[PDB]
Structure formats: C-alpha cells, structure tokens
C-alpha cells in the first residue's frame, strides 16, 4: 500500500534546470519528512536534503552541495514531493531516490530516477583491437582486448565471437573523457586458439545503430 | 559540525563469519528530546537503499535477527552476527539530527579469498587508431586480490601522470577477484616521439613491481 515513485530523470544540459517528482500513496503524506538522496555512478550514496512534516512546518534543509542550486517542495494536497534542480552540472549525474522519514526512519524508498548531465550529443564509438606482441601474458594463455572509445550515451554491448567466448572475459565500466565514454574489454584464450583461430569482439551501440565486429589480429 | 567516521571502508568476510561495522562521531549525536536518530541502511548493487535499524538499536520490520546495532552518544556499531551471501552490499550509517547531516562513506562487505598476483598485459596503439591521430596504450591487470593496487606509467623511463584513465571491475561473481584497466592516451605525435612505454603494477603479492613494457620500435 505504501508507494513512492520518482520520475523526471533523463538527460540534462550543464547549466540546465531539470525537476524531479516523487509521487506517493497508501499513507498520510502530511505526517512525513521526505528525503532526497543520490548515488553517482561508482561513487557512494549521498544525502541531498529533506523537507519537514506539517507539524514542523514544511521547512526544508539541504546539503552544502545542493545549497544554492536545488530546492525541495511538496504538494501536500496531491502527495507529490518535487526536486527542482537548477544550474545543473556533470557532477549531478546519479540516480535519485526519495524516501519518507517517520517513526521508523527512511523505511520506504522510491525505486530511483536516472539523470545524466552532458553537453554531448549521440556519438558513434570507435573500436580498436588490442593485440599483444612479444609475449601474450599468462601460462600458455593469451589476453587480447578491444578498446571502445568516444561514444555517447551509454551503453554499448561488447561480445566475443558472438557470445561463444563467454569465459575469461572482463568488460570494464565506462569512463568519461571529455563528454564521451570509453570502455575496454579483455578476454583470455589458450595460446593454442590464437592466432590460429579467429577472435572477434562485437560492439553494439544502439543509440547510433552501430554494430562493429573487430577481428583481433596479430 | 558533528564530523562522522564510519569504518572500515572495506570489509573482507567469509560467509558464516561475523562482521562489525562502526560509526563514531566527534561529538554526541543525542537529540534534545533524548532520542538518538542513528540509522543503518543497506544498499546492494543496483538496488534502492533498505533500512536495517533505526534509533541506534531498533531493528526495522523484516530485517533478520542476525543484524544488530549498538552504542550510544559518540560510538555505535552494526554487527552482522552470521554473514550470509545475501548481505553482501554497501552499508551506511546515518543520522540527520545534527549538521552535517549525512551518510557515512560506506562499508563495502566483500568476500574473503587467498591473495593472488595480477596477470598484467600491455597493448600498443592499433594502426587504426593512429590513422586517426590518437594513441591509447592499454594495460590490463586482471584477477588480483586484494583490490589494493597501484599502477604507474613510464615513457622512456620517466613517470607519466596526466592522460591516464583507470577503471576497475567489482569482485568477480565466480572467483572473488578484481581486475583493472589503465589507459594512457596521447597524441599520435607524442607516441611517435617516444619509444619505450612501461606499465608498472604494485601489489602486496610481491615486493618487486610487476613491469610490462614494449618498445614502439
């Protein structure tokens, strides 16, 4: 019966002004404080601010970060908490959660809403095969790789031999380098299969309809 | 200005074992009303945070009885009295009655395994990339443990700082290890200016740095 559902996430412009909403149900919205917390990609969950109940007068509180830039509000009559975020920036990319605080703390959280703050437009990825040299690396095993750089937005799907090479694969989390993402993937095969066999990494970037297949070649 | 300190940042555990995470404050966080609003939240990978305990020792509904909270004033403690696979996640203590209101840096509960040296690999830029005027040298360091490791890059002997981007995986779902990728990106010009590129890894599994290198030619 108790429900909190965020909405309003999406892409935003640096210096923009997005606004999130957290609708609730199943409880008396007036009797609760409401928290807004965000978890940036790879970073730790952080607390942004809160708004107080009716009794304590709907007074809000914010962190020193969102201070001056964000503002909590609520629709007491409809049961919708809002998070108006202005002067947006890249650092504001996270998943936003709303929660109600009361006699049992933040016992109900929303499910989250994702925001990405970029000045980038859809960009197709460059795919480069990473081949070894004078040494493969590992006891009779060889590690090959595929660099997937310069794309936007996430994600990309990297596969080895169309899904055959499933074991010995590591796809590392994308990193930002001047608005675009870069990702790399590695695979370890016995020295017997390469280079005698063929090893190909398949990279699909749906947002730009690309699907590149790169043959790893010595 | 109640400065919080939660420890440890990371916690290695073997399933079945006991864990204890602590949250301590420079000053007492007892409220004027007598109550202590110290909470413990559990955020798993890709899930919303879940409340475990509220008001220092009150276990929220649904939370197993193996989870225990304690303390008062300035030092508090969460204590998983029998860790289970389903508890692996990031743990945060929280209090919002005193400025600065906040979550602790977190305590990530990871699975304990035997140490293992990283398998390191270095890769020169592809001819492809260079045809486009850019050169990224890549270094893989997979399957080590503990996660603690430092990578250094050297070009013709000198260490290089700027232009590096690293990324780590999360503990592997099957062998409890971690992997890392270090990429040095330079202009085709810089790359053709130097010949020796070294990727040097430092890890507790050895006093000697693991070095991987290649000469452009």
UniProtKB/Swiss-Prot annotation, chain A:
Disulfide bonds: 146-201
Chain positions covered by the region annotation CH1: 120-216
Cellular component terms per the entry's GO annotation: cytoplasm; external side of plasma membrane; extracellular space; immunoglobulin complex, circulating
Annotated signal sequence range: none
Keyword entries, A-Z: Disulfide bond, Glycoprotein, Immunoglobulin domain, Secreted
Listed GO MF terms: antigen binding
Keyword Secreted recorded: yes
GO biological process: antibacterial humoral response; antibody-dependent cellular cytotoxicity; B cell differentiation; complement activation, classical pathway; defense response to bacterium; humoral immune response mediated by circulating immunoglobulin; immunoglobulin mediated immune response; phagocytosis, engulfment
Domain of life assignment: Eukaryota
Name of the featured protein: Ig gamma-1 chain C region secreted form
Gene: Ighg1
């Amino acid at each position: 019966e108790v429900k909190l559902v965020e909405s309003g996430g999406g892409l935003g412009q640096p210096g923009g002004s997005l606004r999130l909403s957290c609708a609730t149900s199943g409880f008396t919205f007036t009797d609760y404080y409401f928290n807004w917390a965000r978890q940036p990609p790879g970073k730790a969950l952080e607390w942004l601010g809160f708004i107080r109940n009716k009794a304590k007068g709907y007074t809000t509180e914010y962190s020193a970060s969102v201070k001056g830039r964000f503002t909590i509000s609520r629709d007491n009559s409809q049961g919708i908490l809002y998070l108006q975020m202005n002067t947006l920036r890249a650092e504001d990319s996270a998943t936003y959660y709303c929660a109600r605080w009361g006699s049992y703390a933040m016992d109900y959280w929303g499910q989250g809403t994702s925001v990405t703050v970029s000045s980038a437009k859809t960009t197709p990825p460059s795919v480069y095969p990473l081949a070894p040299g004078s040494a493969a690396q590992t006891n009779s095993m060889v590690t090959l790789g595929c660099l997937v750089k310069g794309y936007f937005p996430e994600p990309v799907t990297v596969t080895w031999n169309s899904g055959s090479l499933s074991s010995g694969v590591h796809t590392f989390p994308a990193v930002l380098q001047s608005d675009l993402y870069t990702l790399s993937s590695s695979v370890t095969v016995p020295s017997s299969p390469r280079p005698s066999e063929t090893v190909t990494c398949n990279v699909a970037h749906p947002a730009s309809s690309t699907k590149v297949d790169k043959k790893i070649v010595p | 200005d109640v400065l919080m300190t939660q420890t440890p940042l990371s916690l290695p555990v073997s399933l079945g074992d006991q864990a204890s995470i602590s949250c301590r404050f420079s000053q007492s966080i007892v409220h004027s009303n007598g109550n202590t609003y110290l909470e413990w939240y559990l955020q798993k990978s890709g899930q919303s945070p879940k409340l475990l305990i509220y008001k220092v020792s009150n276990r929220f509904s649904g939370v197993p009885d193996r989870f225990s909270g304690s303390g008062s004033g300035t030092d508090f403690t969460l204590k998983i009295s029998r860790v289970e696979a389903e508890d692996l996640g990031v743990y945060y203590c929280f209090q919002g009655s005193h400025v600065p209101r906040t979550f602790g840096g977190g305590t990530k509960l990871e699975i304990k395994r035997a140490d293992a040296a990283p398998t390191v690999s270095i890769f020169p830029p592809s001819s492809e990339q260079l045809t486009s005027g850019g050169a990224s040298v890549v270094c893989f360091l997979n399957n080590f443990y503990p996660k603690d490791i430092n990578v250094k890059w050297k070009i013709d002997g000198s260490e290089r700082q700027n232009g590096v981007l690293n990324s780590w995986t999360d503990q592997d779902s099957k062998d409890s290890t971690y992997s890392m990728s270090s990429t040095l990106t330079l202009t085709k010009d810089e790359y053709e200016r130097h010949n020796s590129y070294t990727c040097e890894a430092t890890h507790k599994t050895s006093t000697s740095p693991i070095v991987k290198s290649f000469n452009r030619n």
